[PDB]
Design an enzyme around this catalytic site. Structure first.
Site, PDB file in Angstrom:
ATOM      1  N   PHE A 107       4.697  -5.833  19.414  1.00 57.87           N
ATOM      2  CA  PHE A 107       4.415  -7.359  19.646  1.00 57.87           C
ATOM      3  C   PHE A 107       5.463  -8.129  20.552  1.00 57.87           C
ATOM      4  CE2 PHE A 107       5.606 -12.206  18.266  1.00 57.87           C
ATOM      5  CZ  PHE A 107       4.386 -12.638  18.535  1.00 57.87           C
ATOM      6  N   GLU A 120       0.861  -1.382  -0.032  1.00 56.66           N
ATOM      7  CA  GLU A 120      -0.044  -0.038  -0.052  1.00 56.66           C
ATOM      8  C   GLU A 120       0.885   1.362   0.114  1.00 56.66           C
ATOM      9  OE1 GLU A 120      -4.096   0.977   1.258  1.00 56.66           O
ATOM     10  OE2 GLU A 120      -3.141   1.484   3.458  1.00 56.66           O
ATOM     11  N   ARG A 127      -8.546  -9.810  10.750  1.00 59.64           N
ATOM     12  CA  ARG A 127      -8.705  -8.298  11.369  1.00 59.64           C
ATOM     13  C   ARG A 127      -9.356  -8.490  12.692  1.00 59.64           C
ATOM     14  NH1 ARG A 127      -9.358  -4.287   8.358  1.00 59.64           N
ATOM     15  NH2 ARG A 127     -10.553  -3.221   9.559  1.00 59.64           N
ATOM     16  N   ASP A 145      -7.780   2.344   7.491  1.00 64.88           N
ATOM     17  CA  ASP A 145      -8.296   1.308   8.222  1.00 64.88           C
ATOM     18  C   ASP A 145      -8.624   1.991   9.719  1.00 64.88           C
ATOM     19  OD1 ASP A 145      -7.321  -2.079   8.588  1.00 64.88           O
ATOM     20  OD2 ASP A 145      -8.542  -1.028   9.845  1.00 64.88           O
TER      21      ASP A 145
HETATM   22  O1  LIG Z   1      -3.398 -12.750   0.328  1.00 63.79           O
HETATM   23  C1  LIG Z   1      -3.987 -11.501   0.580  1.00 63.79           C
HETATM   24  C2  LIG Z   1      -5.307 -11.036   0.905  1.00 63.79           C
HETATM   25  C3  LIG Z   1      -5.690  -9.879   0.917  1.00 63.79           C
HETATM   26  N1  LIG Z   1      -4.774  -8.873   0.349  1.00 63.79           N
HETATM   27  C4  LIG Z   1      -4.991  -7.465   0.494  1.00 63.79           C
HETATM   28  O2  LIG Z   1      -5.533  -7.188   1.752  1.00 63.79           O
HETATM   29  C5  LIG Z   1      -6.844  -6.380   1.616  1.00 63.79           C
HETATM   30  C6  LIG Z   1      -7.847  -6.684   2.544  1.00 63.79           C
HETATM   31  O3  LIG Z   1      -7.645  -6.260   3.658  1.00 63.79           O
HETATM   32  P1  LIG Z   1      -8.159  -6.409   4.923  1.00 63.79           P
HETATM   33  O4  LIG Z   1      -8.241  -7.917   5.348  1.00 63.79           O
HETATM   34  O5  LIG Z   1      -7.843  -5.494   6.079  1.00 63.79           O
HETATM   35  O6  LIG Z   1      -9.777  -6.331   4.603  1.00 63.79           O
HETATM   36  P2  LIG Z   1     -10.604  -4.862   4.432  1.00 63.79           P
HETATM   37  O7  LIG Z   1     -10.863  -4.403   5.464  1.00 63.79           O
HETATM   38  O8  LIG Z   1      -9.604  -4.422   3.358  1.00 63.79           O
HETATM   39  O9  LIG Z   1     -11.652  -5.466   3.611  1.00 63.79           O
HETATM   40  C7  LIG Z   1      -7.262  -6.839   0.114  1.00 63.79           C
HETATM   41  O10 LIG Z   1      -8.172  -6.012  -0.639  1.00 63.79           O
HETATM   42  C8  LIG Z   1      -5.712  -7.023  -0.758  1.00 63.79           C
HETATM   43  O11 LIG Z   1      -5.308  -5.811  -1.159  1.00 63.79           O
HETATM   44  C9  LIG Z   1      -3.504  -9.370  -0.038  1.00 63.79           C
HETATM   45  O12 LIG Z   1      -2.945  -8.521  -0.651  1.00 63.79           O
HETATM   46  N2  LIG Z   1      -3.197 -10.661  -0.057  1.00 63.79           N
END
Ligand SMILES: O=c1ccn([C@@H]2O[C@H](COP(=O)(O)OP(=O)(O)O)[C@@H](O)[C@H]2O)c(=O)[nH]1
Length: 351
Positions: A72, A22, A191, A100
């Site tokens: 951590f 990102e 998450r 986030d």
């Molecule tokens: O193996 C993986 C799984 C997820 N992602 C990235 O992580 C994001 C999801 O982030 P999160 O799990 O925090 O969920 P969100 O809150 O973004 O839905 C996806 O959109 C992808 O850009 C990635 O690069 N590789």
């Protein structure tokens, strides 16, 4: 005009990790905007300069990607500590990219001071006193303000769809027709359980061939309030730049979010899914006004409706292709507003 962008708690190197990815993507889209930007991280590399080789005040704007500042194992984390020392020395306004909900700006000092290794740092060194402007990916600034209620130096808030960098990148392209090996797919982390109910609802006990890729693991889903019998297949994580290709292996890809994302945040997966060869199926609660696509066929209210929708998609290749055509066009509609998006970002960082 020289800009510095850093990740507040993660090392930045390549596309092997999401936080690193990102940060680089943001660096790229800002550069493609005609702006002079440098990524500052722990070491000098393909896309970065080290904190040590630069003078933070040599930059006119300091942009910070949000991150947790939790240590951590209670041990020192140089990514976190070095980033905040860098920020603390900056004498101008700091622009915090809030992508986030769980990662609002937070001071590391209050935590470090009570650590047994506190003697290694000082308040003057880590305490960030510069004024901070939060650039909220969510349109609801009241929610953004509440999240930053503990830090009084965050005095400005502005909405900006940060996550659109995925579609505005010069190298972007829609996914091509892909051989299907899955019915439904979803990629992401656990998450910290903030979305367990929704994950269990739409991805577990569906009777469909579902894959959950990313950091999440089956053993993390153990909240007795959201029981299940059959779990989807969990596969490892993949680089962020390989996500749309991954989503494309499925007939459909799920869109769900945290409670505070509903009708507020548009996430990266919305674009990664819309651009893929998988039909985007959105949880009704995530976008009740259907602002993503004004067509009810892309929305599902519960597990039963998701299963029924997938069966329809599997039954009619014509329907599936039509919906793919619709979401691809809708995505391009937003891409057509690239210039405006770029101008809104510059305005966001006072340019
Ligand atoms: O193996 C993986 C799984 C997820 N992602 C990235 O992580 C994001 C999801 O982030 P999160 O799990 O925090 O969920 P969100 O809150 O973004 O839905 C996806 O959109 C992808 O850009 C990635 O690069 N590789």
């Amino acid at each position: 005009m020289k800009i510095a962008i850093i990740n507040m708690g993660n090392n930045v190197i390549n596309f092997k990790t999401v936080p690193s990815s990102e940060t680089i993507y943001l660096f790229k889209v800002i550069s493609e905007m005609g702006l002079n930007v440098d990524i500052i991280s722990l070491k000098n590399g393909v896309y970065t300069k080290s904190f040590d080789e630069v003078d933070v005040n040599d930059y006119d704007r300091l942009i910070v990607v949000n991150s947790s500042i939790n240590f951590f194992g209670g041990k020192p984390n140089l990514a976190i500590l070095s980033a905040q020392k860098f920020m603390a020395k900056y004498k101008s306004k700091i622009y915090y990219l809030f992508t986030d909900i769980r990662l609002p700006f937070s001071q590391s000092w209050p935590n470090v001071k009570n650590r047994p290794w506190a003697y290694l740092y000082t308040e003057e060194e880590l305490l960030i006193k510069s004024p901070i402007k939060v650039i909220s990916q969510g349109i609801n600034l009241d929610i953004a303000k509440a999240a930053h209620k503990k830090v009084d130096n965050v005095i400005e808030f502005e909405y900006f769809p940060i996550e659109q960098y995925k579609i505005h990148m010069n190298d972007f392209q829609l996914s091509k027709p892909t051989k299907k090996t899955l019915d439904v797919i979803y990629g992401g982390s656990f998450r910290s359980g903030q979305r367990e109910s929704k994950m269990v609802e739409f991805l577990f006990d569906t009777g469909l061939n579902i894959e959950f890729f990313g950091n999440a693991r089956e053993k993390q889903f153990k909240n007795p309030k959201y029981p299940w019998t059959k779990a989807p297949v969990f596969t490892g994580k993949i680089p962020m730049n390989m996500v749309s290709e991954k989503n494309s292996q499925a007939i459909a890809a799920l869109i769900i979010g945290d409670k505070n994302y509903n009708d507020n945040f548009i996430t990266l997966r919305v674009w990664e899914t819309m651009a893929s060869d998988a039909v985007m199926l959105i949880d009704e609660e995530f976008d009740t006004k259907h602002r993503i696509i004004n067509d009810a066929r892309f929305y599902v209210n519960n597990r039963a409706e998701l299963i029924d929708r997938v069966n329809e998609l599997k039954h009619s290749d014509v329907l599936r292709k039509e919906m793919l055509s619709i979401q691809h066009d809708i995505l391009n509609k937003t891409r057509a507003k690239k210039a405006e998006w770029q101008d809104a970002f510059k305005k966001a960082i006072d340019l």
